[PDB]
RNA sequence: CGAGCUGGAGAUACGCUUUGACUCGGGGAUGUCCGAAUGGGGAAACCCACCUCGUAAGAGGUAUCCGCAAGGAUGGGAACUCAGGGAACUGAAACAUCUCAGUACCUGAAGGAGAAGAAAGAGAAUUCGAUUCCGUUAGUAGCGGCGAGCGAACCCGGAUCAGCCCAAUCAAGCCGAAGUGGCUGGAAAGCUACACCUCAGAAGGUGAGAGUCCUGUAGGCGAACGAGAGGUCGUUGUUCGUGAAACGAUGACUGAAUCCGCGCGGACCACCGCGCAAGGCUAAAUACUCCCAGUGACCGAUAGCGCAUAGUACCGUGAGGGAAAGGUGAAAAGAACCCCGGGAGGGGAGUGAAAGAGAACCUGAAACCGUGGACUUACAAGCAGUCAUGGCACCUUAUGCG
RNA sequence: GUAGGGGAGCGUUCAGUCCGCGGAGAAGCCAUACCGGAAGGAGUGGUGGAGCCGACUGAAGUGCGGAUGCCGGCAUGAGUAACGAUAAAAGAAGUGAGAAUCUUCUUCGCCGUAAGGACAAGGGUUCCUGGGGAAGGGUCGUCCGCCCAGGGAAAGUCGGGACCUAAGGUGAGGCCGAACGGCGCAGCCGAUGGACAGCAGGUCAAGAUUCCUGCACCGAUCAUGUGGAGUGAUGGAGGG
């Protein structure tokens, strides 16, 4: 359902700085429509979104011993809200 | 000098592709024959 | 709990129990991805519960139409 | 064209040839100061002495 | 080609049982079953006992450090004991209650 | 089943389990996207829609062909089966008929088999009685540039038996006999002294070789669910190559009798015999072996499958081709700690029966590279040996035949 | 005594049977002056660490120097040729276990319709940061396009799609053909073309007509007003 769509938050110098300007960044399910993501974030956080952007991200191909393989392809979503609305569980961070 | 192999995604797919191979009995016969050999690479679209 | 606790309740209560479980699983995903996730097991456990729920409401909905 | 050897060269031959590859060990002198060793007419690489003291430490 | 394959992944004794060591260097010493692994057929008995080394790792502690811990054994050097005989003893399956299966010798039971 | 479990994975953490986990057996629920793909498109696994319900979330439907409907079909399957189509090399010591051979290959349809089948027959006894398969007849009768070479059938003996209708017990599992002491050894199964069970001495595991230590075997028990017409031309089939060519089989043209009638019996006629075409189904014996189990004067790492697993790496645009690979130890007790070095590597120590097993770990031959020692070689012409003698050296089948 | 014929045997695996050895140590490997008419065979010693000899009998994947034979390992040529454009280097300084090769500074030299910059095709994480140094780098490396980890890519307006048609590919119906199949009108797929709304700046270590700032634009749906009778397709024409 809703909660299924949001795999994880993005953790990195970039993303923190973004939330410090009130802009948050989530690892999403690769098939997700932007509207689906928008709605999902709203329900999960009771926050009105004014802007989204997304990006499909090919997973790094790495090797373990003789075994060459690919990590899961992902999708990154960046959202910016109105009203300087924040999200607590990820703001203190 | 210009060499034989000159990469082209659409070429390769349209020529050695799964849809291509399925479009004909002889290509179907490749598909089956390959499956049988246990190839990881059934067909070019597997790359 | 797997058998008892589920069947006794309404199919409109299932939707709710499901939803809440989903939500907890996501919380645990954020935590885990940020660290540490002190209790991994809970994840899997919650997973199971979800399954049970959907199994039950399936079973029941087809046993009430027997 | 393209000369090539007619016959494998014996281990014996090959080694007779090598009778001249002996390295020549340095003639080595002991520095009149800091005392390790040096090459004649070079700076003693331990201290740095060549009568007073040229290279650094 | 696993060790349990020959012994049908079956343990001829339970965990917590006392056991006499049949074969080897520790002939006859006795102990409580601290750990028993069916598929591998390996069992721990407070008597075998070795000195293991913890090498580099700064956990536990920067320096090395040695250690005294028992090293598991192959099922086939283990037996249930008989309080009377006190010795290496076979087992018969007989009945009690109330649906319980139990274990006797030539004079039940453990 | 009854105490462990948390996959190969051996790794830390979290934890589950006698309210019965894990594993085994048996059914169900869920089952994304592609692939016959089937809503439409498409460079497989992705892009775009429409309809009904629904609060949205979501759910379901939207291909073509047979049919009124119900329902059926499409795709896949190593070999085996039948059918439509159908090679050449090669053999004829050249070649064309012939042969390879109705083999290879291609396509089709189908099953666990399939085909075939219920005499207008085979045949010569006025005998036999659906078909297939095995033996045999038999390399016989025949065929044949009568060359190469090709090659039946009847009888007889077996395997399995069948002939009916239409058109006027096995799949989880449980129970299950009998030994101890001393000796060698790191370690007991081996030795040794007495001892026992056997409807059970098949086999594997246990520190070396165990009937009586473990798993088992003989034997017994065992489930709610589970499973059992004629003709003419052109041709061809069987031994059937135009032969005197019957008979079946159709492509073309043409086309009769229905019981005193019809079809055959190797041109053709009479006679004498066997037969009821043009309407359908049919199990069984037979074939095969992807899969499963048992066995082996089969293989044990260049062998055996290509693989101790991989159709991988690698090569190729593609079709397609395609490897090498094995071993510490009984047990990780996988070497704390010290020394040189950035490390690599090593020397100690410790473990071990053995590190003369240390992870570039069973044995570890030969080529090939080196260190050390013996006797030797700087006036010498050589397939490097062989014979004879002298010198030095050496003394475990050795003071002589060395 | 060559082709060839004949005769008696040696050795190898596997198999049956008999004998029998083996941790006080098997097979295999290694040395050797002994034995036999030869294939060959024993004695002792060193190695090794778990199986095996002798005898009779049976069956073979049964004996190698050749085949420009096959797989594999290692020699020779040899410390030889070469180190891949003759655009060119020098010093200081730093680092570091180690520097001609890495970093900084100062110069020098070479390209400059290029040897500079930006797209496409192709490649696929090679980008940025921090670390590493076995191999890869034709030397060396402390460095790297290599190895490890973590980050990084943001679009109503750029390109593609939810629009269009070309060649071509398809294609119900329909036309042919032993089979598989070959054609084929409309329709449909098909960019290399038609169509189409956003510019100027700023800045991550790594993105920018995407993010941030500044001010525009486009269609769509609704509300308030201007409404106050037309809307104009799957066909026509203009146009493109
Ligand atoms: Mg985007
Ligand atoms: Mg990498
Ligand atoms: Mg169990
Ligand atoms: Mg589709
Ligand atoms: Mg010919
Ligand atoms: Mg010929
Ligand atoms: Mg088929
Ligand atoms: Mg004719
Ligand atoms: Mg004919
Ligand atoms: Mg006829
Ligand atoms: Mg070997
Ligand atoms: Mg070391
Ligand atoms: Mg010497
Ligand atoms: Mg002279
Ligand atoms: Mg001389
Ligand atoms: Mg003679
Ligand atoms: Mg024998
Ligand atoms: Mg042998
Ligand atoms: Mg040779
Ligand atoms: Mg040559
Ligand atoms: Mg070679
Ligand atoms: Mg030189
Ligand atoms: Mg030379
Ligand atoms: Mg030279
Ligand atoms: Mg040179
Ligand atoms: Mg160069
Ligand atoms: Mg130069
Ligand atoms: Mg320094
Ligand atoms: Mg340079
Ligand atoms: Mg400076
Ligand atoms: Mg340029
Ligand atoms: Mg990309
Ligand atoms: Mg180098
Ligand atoms: Mg460093
Ligand atoms: Mg870089
Ligand atoms: Mg904007
Ligand atoms: Mg066409
Ligand atoms: Mg274009
Ligand atoms: Mg535009
Ligand atoms: Mg566009």
From Swiss-Prot, chain A:
PROSITE patterns in UniProt: RIBOSOMAL_L23
Single Gene Ontology BP annotation: translation
One MF annotation (Gene Ontology) recorded for this entry: structural constituent of ribosome
GO cellular component: cytosolic large ribosomal subunit
Pfam families given in the database record: Ribosomal_L23 (PF00276)
UniProt keywords, alphabetically: Ribonucleoprotein, Ribosomal protein, RNA-binding, rRNA-binding
Family matches, as PANTHER family: 60S RIBOSOMAL PROTEIN L23A
Quaternary assembly: Part of the 50S ribosomal subunit. Contacts protein L29 and trigger factor when it is bound to the ribosome.
Biological role: One of the early assembly protein it binds 23S rRNA. One of the proteins that surrounds the polypeptide exit tunnel on the outside of the subunit. Forms the main docking site for trigger factor binding to the ribosome.
Name recorded for this polypeptide: Large ribosomal subunit protein uL23
Species in which this protein is naturally found: Deinococcus radiodurans (strain ATCC 13939 / DSM 20539 / JCM 16871 / CCUG 27074 / LMG 4051 / NBRC 15346 / NCIMB 9279 / VKM B-1422 / R1)
Swiss-Prot record, chain C:
InterPro entries: Ribosomal_protein_uL29 (IPR050063), Ribosomal_uL29 (IPR001854), Ribosomal_uL29_CS (IPR018254), Ribosomal_uL29_sf (IPR036049)
GO MF annotation terms: rRNA binding; structural constituent of ribosome
Keyword Ligase listed: no
Pfam families named in the record: Ribosomal_L29
SUPFAM superfamilies for this protein: Ribosomal protein L29 (L29p)
Keyword vocabulary terms for this entry: Ribonucleoprotein, Ribosomal protein, RNA-binding, rRNA-binding
Top-rank taxon, per record: Bacteria
HAMAP family cross-referenced by the UniProt entry: Ribosomal_uL29 (MF_00374)
Stated name of the protein: Large ribosomal subunit protein uL29
Origin organism lineage: Bacteria, Thermotogati, Deinococcota, Deinococci, Deinococcales
Name of the coding gene: rpmC
From Swiss-Prot, chain D:
Cofactor(s) required, per the database record: Zn(2+)
Protein's name according to its UniProt entry: Large ribosomal subunit protein bL32
Residue ranges with Basic residues bias: 1-21
Role this protein plays: Forms a cluster with L17 and L22, and with L22, a pair of 'tweezers' that hold together all the domains of the 23S rRNA. Interacts with the antibiotic troleandomycin which blocks the peptide exit tunnel.
Cofactor note: Binds 1 zinc ion per subunit.
Family indicated by similarity: Belongs to the bacterial ribosomal protein bL32 family.
Region (Disordered): 1-32
Top-rank taxon: Bacteria
Keyword Transmembrane part of the UniProt annotation: no
SUPFAM superfamilies linked: Zn-binding ribosomal proteins
GO molecular function, a single term: zinc ion binding
Residues that hold Zn(2+) according to the record: 31, 34, 44, 47
Self-association and partners: Part of the 50S ribosomal subunit. Contacts proteins L17 and L22.
Record key words, sorted: Metal-binding, Ribonucleoprotein, Ribosomal protein, RNA-binding, rRNA-binding, Zinc, Zinc-finger
Species: Deinococcus radiodurans (strain ATCC 13939 / DSM 20539 / JCM 16871 / CCUG 27074 / LMG 4051 / NBRC 15346 / NCIMB 9279 / VKM B-1422 / R1)
Signal peptide start-end: none
Curated annotation (Swiss-Prot), chain E:
Name of the protein in its database record: Large ribosomal subunit protein uL24
Xref: PANTHER family: MITOCHONDRIAL RIBOSOMAL PROTEIN L24 (PTHR12903)
Superkingdom of the organism of origin: Bacteria
Subunit description: Part of the 50S ribosomal subunit. Contacts trigger factor when it is bound to the ribosome.
GO cellular component, one term: cytosolic large ribosomal subunit
GO molecular function, one term: rRNA binding
Task of the protein: One of two assembly initiator proteins, it binds directly to the 5'-end of the 23S rRNA, where it nucleates assembly of the 50S subunit.
Keyword rRNA-binding found: yes
Pfam families according to UniProt: KOW, ribosomal_L24
GO biological process: translation
Family: Belongs to the universal ribosomal protein uL24 family.
Disulphide bond pairs: none
